[PDB]
């Protein structure tokens, strides 16, 4: 039987009842606002007093602006205390990714029977970094590379970064500024500008975009935006897939003619949808994340196409102490054109690399270029002779990836404890086992005209590899190292068994 000093909550306590139930009762009352109930047991519960929160203060925020932490709380000052109104605040801070640890505490107000002090403690993480360097010699000249990226710029909450490079063959730069909080209610605003002039064929492009978004629920948010890209191409090497597109656009390049040009002006509309219930920024143990984005063209553009990309992952713990965890990952996407227009090749999907599929060379998975028989000053000993009139008299096969219109990648990763625990590694290094596989294939591939060549429309040629990976959030930023051994490969494929990259994505 159950009895107690309850404020009428007999139905709720009966529902709870129908050895640990005493704590579920404590949680129920904490939701109502009793900070220190007493339960004895044939159980008698003394609800106690109602409590109010006197003030909220933070310690350890030496770099971040105070507004950054207060905006993430749900419990307001001058209101009754609730357990649900603080614990979510604790989870909320972890999702920013700006802290090493998050602690919570409840203190009594001296001399005040019904008031408490709510205190949060954080340790700020070193997360940003700036790099530059040069390369110079009389043989090639001097090249420059520099840029900066930070998630939190001087503690103001703004996500910014500037990158670019200049060398003898290409000019590239981008600038991005995003404000995660434009209004007090969580409305976001940001965008970017870029320039990409690649002189090597000739490939010159530039453009900008602006994106708006806002939350719609506690775990869901929406995004939308606009942008513009300029594309001017010239002297492209004739290819079957490339000319299919050109014919779709109404172009008629001369047969095997290296002297050509093409430019387009494409206006697009951006949108997306996200879900995020993860309990950590760097190393999560629970929840799942879904990121669905895409773009469509609008009237007045030269190209007519759409693109949808899905990126999601799920973490499920095995051990009660979250030392054994299993991670699933999958990526999906699809695109096409409208009105008879093919999707432009510069938006094609690529797969492979240390980031997307381990053990394969970056962007080497997928259909390969098929070159037509011209002449050049590189024919004697420097050019791809089968692309000229002398090296070949028919269509030449190659291993040159062109990208596709559809892809699918998935992997299963088994996350385990490290070989040992140390103060510098206990919460900074994690190791795991994985199984990676995926596939990229084309559409509108006319296998009836080209029979002696591979059929790129058959999605069943699945690429697969496996290996071991090491993650480290080093003082110089995230780093991931891994080794994998491919098992299933097809003619034209390339592999890299030892790969690493920056641990960002």
């Amino acid at each position: 039987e159950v009895s107690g000093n309850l404020a009428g909550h007999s139905a709720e306590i009966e529902q709870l009842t129908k050895t640990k139930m005493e704590d579920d009762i404590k949680k129920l009352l904490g939701r109502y606002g009793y900070a220190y109930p007493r339960v004895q047991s044939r159980v008698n519960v003394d609800a106690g007093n109602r409590f109010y929160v006197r003030k909220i203060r933070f310690e350890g925020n030496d770099t971040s602006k105070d507004a950054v932490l207060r905006r993430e709380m749900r419990q307001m000052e001058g209101a009754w205390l609730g357990s649900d109104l603080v614990d979510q605040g604790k989870e909320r801070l972890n999702r920013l990714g700006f802290f090493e640890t998050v602690d919570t505490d409840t203190q009594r107000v001296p001399g005040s029977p019904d008031q408490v002090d709510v205190v949060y403690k954080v340790k700020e993480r070193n997360t940003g970094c700036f790099n530059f360097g040069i390369g110079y010699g009389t043989e090639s000249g001097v090249s420059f590379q520099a840029g900066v990226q930070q998630d939190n710029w001087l503690g103001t909450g703004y996500a910014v970064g500037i990158n670019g490079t200049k060398n003898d063959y290409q000019t590239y730069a981008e600038l991005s500024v995003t404000n995660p909080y434009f209004t007090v209610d969580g409305v976001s605003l940001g965008g970017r500008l870029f320039y990409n002039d690649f002189q090597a064929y000739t490939n010159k492009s530039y453009g900008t975009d602006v994106t708006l978004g806002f939350p719609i629920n506690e775990y869901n948010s929406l995004r939308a935006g606009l942008g513009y890209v300029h594309n001017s191409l010239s002297n492209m090497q004739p290819q079957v897939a490339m000319w299919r597109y050109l014919y779709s656009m109404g172009e008629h390049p001369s047969t095997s003619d290296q002297d050509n040009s093409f430019k387009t002006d494409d206006f697009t509309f951006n949108y997306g949808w996200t879900y995020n219930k993860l309990d950590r920024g760097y190393f999560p143990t629970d929840g799942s994340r879904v990121n669905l984005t895409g773009k469509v063209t609008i009237p007045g553009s030269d190209n007519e196409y759409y693109k949808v990309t899905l990126d999601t992952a799920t973490y499920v713990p095995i051990d009660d102490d979250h030392k054994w965890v299993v991670l699933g990952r999958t990526r999906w996407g699809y695109g096409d054109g409208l009105g008879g227009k093919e999707m432009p090749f510069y938006e094609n999907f690529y797969a492979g690399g240390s980031s997307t599929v381990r053990g394969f060379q970056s962007n080497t998975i997928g259909p390969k270029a098929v070159y037509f028989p011209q002449a050049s000053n590189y024919d004697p000993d420097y050019d791809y002779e089968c692309a000229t009139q002398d090296g070949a008299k028919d269509l030449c096969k190659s291993d040159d990836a062109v990208g596709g219109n559809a892809m699918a990648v998935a992997s299963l990763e088994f996350i385990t404890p490290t070989p040992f625990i140390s103060d510098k590694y206990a919460n900074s290094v994690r190791t795991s086992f994985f199984w990676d596989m995926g596939t990229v294939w084309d559409t509108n591939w006319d296998s009836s005209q080209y029979s002696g060549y591979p059929d790129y429309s058959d999605p069943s040629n699945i690429r697969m590899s496996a290996g071991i990976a090491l993650q480290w959030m080093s003082p110089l930023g995230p780093l991931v190292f891994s080794y994998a051994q491919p098992f299933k490969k097809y003619d034209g494929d390339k592999a890299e068994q030892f790969q690493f990259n920056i641990g960002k994505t």
């Binding site: 109010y52 307001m76 001058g78 009754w80 005040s112 719609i216």
Partner: protein, 89 residues
Amino acid sequence: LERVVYRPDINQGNYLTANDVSKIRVGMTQQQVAYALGTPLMSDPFGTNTWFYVFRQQPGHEGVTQQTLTLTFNSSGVLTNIDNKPALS
């Protein structure tokens, strides 16, 4: 969009219920009032011996509901008046 974007519920002030408000009577001491209702959250910073109990809630995509209770005391700490405003004008 103004009515679409999610907003968290905001609570302000002390909790009140009719079951407890009806228990206050003129002649009670400050200790009896604080015991029955709890510690006041607002007072007159400029010296008036009065306590303010304000219950205000503003749910998302909802209007504002509130009740204002003003308690006045004499120099002896004895409650002199009960100002009950069940709703905002």
